[PDB]
Amino acid sequence: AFKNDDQKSAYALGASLGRYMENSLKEQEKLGIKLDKDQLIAGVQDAFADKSKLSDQEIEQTLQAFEARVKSSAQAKMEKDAADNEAKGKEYREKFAKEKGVKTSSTGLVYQVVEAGKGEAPKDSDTVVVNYKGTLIDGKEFDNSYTRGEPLSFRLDGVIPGWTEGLKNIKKGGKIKLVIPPELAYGKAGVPGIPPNSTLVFDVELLDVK
Amino acid sequence: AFKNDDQKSAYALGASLGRYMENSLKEQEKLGIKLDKDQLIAGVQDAFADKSKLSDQEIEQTLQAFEARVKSSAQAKMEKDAADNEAKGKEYREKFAKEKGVKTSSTGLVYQVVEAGKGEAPKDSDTVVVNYKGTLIDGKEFDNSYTRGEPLSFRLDGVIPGWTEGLKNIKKGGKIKLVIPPELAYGKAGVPGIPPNSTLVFDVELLDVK
Numbered sequence: 515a516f517k518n519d520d521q522k523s524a525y526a527l528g529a530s531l532g533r534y535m536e537n538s539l540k541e542q543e544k545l546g547i548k549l550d551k552d553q554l555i556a557g558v559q560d561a562f563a564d565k566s567k568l569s570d571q572e573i574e575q576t577l578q579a580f581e582a583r584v585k586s587s588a589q590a591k592m593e594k595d596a597a598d599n600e601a602k603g604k605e606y607r608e609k610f611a612k613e614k615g616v617k618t619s620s621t622g623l624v625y626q627v628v629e630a631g632k633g634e635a636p637k638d639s640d641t642v643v644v645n646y647k648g649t650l651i652d653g654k655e656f657d658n659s660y661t662r663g664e665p666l667s668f669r670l671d672g673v674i675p676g677w678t679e680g681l682k683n684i685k686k687g688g689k690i691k692l693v694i695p696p697e698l699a700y701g702k703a704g705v706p707g708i709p710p711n712s713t714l715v716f717d718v719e720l721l722d723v724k
Numbered sequence: 725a726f727k728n729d730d731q732k733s734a735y736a737l738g739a740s741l742g743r744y745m746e747n748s749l750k751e752q753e754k755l756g757i758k759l760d761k762d763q764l765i766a767g768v769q770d771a772f773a774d775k776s777k778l779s780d781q782e783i784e785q786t787l788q789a790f791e792a793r794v795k796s797s798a799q800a801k802m803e804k805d806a807a808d809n810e811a812k813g814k815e816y817r818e819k820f821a822k823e824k825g826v827k828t829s830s831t832g833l834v835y836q837v838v839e840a841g842k843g844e845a846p847k848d849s850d851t852v853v854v855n856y857k858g859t860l861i862d863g864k865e866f867d868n869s870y871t872r873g874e875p876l877s878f879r880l881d882g883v884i885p886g887w888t889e890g891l892k893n894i895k896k897g898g899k900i901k902l903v904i905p906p907e908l909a910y911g912k913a914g915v916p917g918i919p920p921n922s923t924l925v926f927d928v929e930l931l932d933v934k
């Protein structure tokens with residue numbers, strides 16, 4: 515294929531800009547914003563060959579207005595998701611908390627011990643070894659150590675408060691379901707894969723405490 | 725001929741990215757690196773269609789090596805420039821030093837007293853106030869105090885050695901032309917606006933010694 519570097523590196527540098535444009539389009543689609551892909555490419559080709567059909571001022575201004583649109587659309591969507599997820603989350607916890615075997619701690623953490631396990635109570639400075647499954651209240655799975663490949667280890671005080679607190683309710687060999695409010699998890703900001711004010715549901719198997 | 729925002733903003737976004745690429749390639753060009761632009765647009769299109777001939781891993785691998793080639797070529801070019809200026813500067817100094825009224829000091833500073841001035845000469849702990857104009861040997865002006873509408877003040881011992889020494893050759897009210905070898909100036913590394921091993925030409929007026 516590639517005869518050498520002025521070729522290989524060029525293609526890579528280009529592939530990388532492609533990649534980047536696809537990723538970018540992917541975030542705009544979250545907001546219902548769909549740019550014309552043929553035009554996006556034509557602009558790239560035109561510029562790369564110095565034949566842009568828009569002046570530098572028209573480019574500056576068009577981008578300026580477009581990025582105001584994106585930010586203004588993303589902000590509104592964050593705001594609405596935050597409020598929606600806070601209320602749906604609350605309702606969800608309230609319903610689940612009333613069920614048999616389910617408990618609510620003084621912090622608002624809602625949990626269901628499935629297997630107590632046996633051994634020492636995990637403490638903040640312990641390293642726990644776990645398998646887990648993490649999903650949003652709507653059933654969307656966001657994390658799964660099982661399909662990731664191996665049991666994960668961490669310091670108990672290095673994880674979110676919902677976990678630091680929850681795992682203390684069981685021992686090695688145990689299993690618990692944690693239903694965690696955003697204020698004991700990722701809050702209003704959320705993190706990639708976790709929307710604002712998200713209540714999280716984890717099914718955790720505690721393999722070791724060391 | 726854009727009909728709508730999804731069309732115009734997309735073109736704009738593309739043109740802006742492609743212009744960014746072209747600007748980086750232009751810098752690569754100053755170093756003798758001229759990427760194959762047909763392959764570059766091939767990568768853009770292929771990755772855009774999710775058919776990059778390079779995997780994400782290969783892309784990253786290719787660009788790391790490419791990045792190493794650029795830096796290495798950047799260094800080679802500073803080295804060639806260092807050698808070229810050193811030589812060109814030595815010739816320029818040699819020719820000028822033979823002219824009527826020009827002197828060469830023991831350190832290799834070449835200078836021409838235009839007006840002796842009158843009063844004390846600058847000594848090491850002293851402060852001097854000067855107007856000056858600095859140019860590279862080809863005539864490009866890198867600094868001109870006259871344009872700030874005010875002279876410059878500094879400690880004689882706080883400046884490059886060619887000035888520290890050179891100004892001891894005149895007195896308050898004097899003028900002198902200093903032709904300074906790189907080793908009494910910014911040396912092989914230079915500074916922004918002053919290339920490697922540049923010989924500097926300064927026209928100085930000494931206003932005060934205090």
Ligand SMILES: C=CC[C@@H]1/C=C(\C)C[C@H](C)C[C@H](OC)[C@H]2O[C@@](O)(C(=O)C(=O)N3CCCC[C@H]3C(=O)O[C@H](/C(C)=C/[C@@H]3CC[C@@H](O)[C@H](OC)C3)[C@H](C)[C@@H](O)CC1=O)[C@H](C)C[C@@H]2OC
Nearest residue numbers: 648656657658666668672673674677699700701705707708
């Ligand atoms: C940047 C370094 C990467 C580094 C990545 C790893 C070692 C891999 C590790 C298996 C994480 C998973 O990666 C595949 C993935 O697991 C999640 O999907 C998840 O199920 C989860 O919620 N878990 C994992 C299990 C314990 C509860 C919790 C957590 O406490 O996770 C912790 C977490 C993110 C705490 C933040 C820390 C920042 C604070 O500001 C914030 O405070 C609000 C809380 C994890 C252990 C971090 O400490 C360590 C890291 O982040 C997150 C949704 C995102 C996370 O990927 C990043």
Ligand SMILES: C=CC[C@@H]1/C=C(\C)C[C@H](C)C[C@H](OC)[C@H]2O[C@@](O)(C(=O)C(=O)N3CCCC[C@H]3C(=O)O[C@H](/C(C)=C/[C@@H]3CC[C@@H](O)[C@H](OC)C3)[C@H](C)[C@@H](O)CC1=O)[C@H](C)C[C@@H]2OC
Nearest residue numbers: 856858866867876878882883884885887909910915917918
């Ligand atoms: C708050 C005060 C900070 C103050 C910062 C500024 C005003 C910088 C500002 C942009 C304009 C500078 O000039 C006003 C400008 O001056 C040049 O254009 C120039 O014509 C020059 O070569 N000059 C100026 C006149 C005397 C000769 C000489 C010099 O010796 O300059 C001196 C110098 C740089 C000494 C270094 C000291 C460290 C040594 O290690 C090095 O030795 C290698 C030499 C100057 C006087 C410093 O004392 C002044 C300062 O520090 C340089 C090409 C680049 C330099 O800007 C970067």
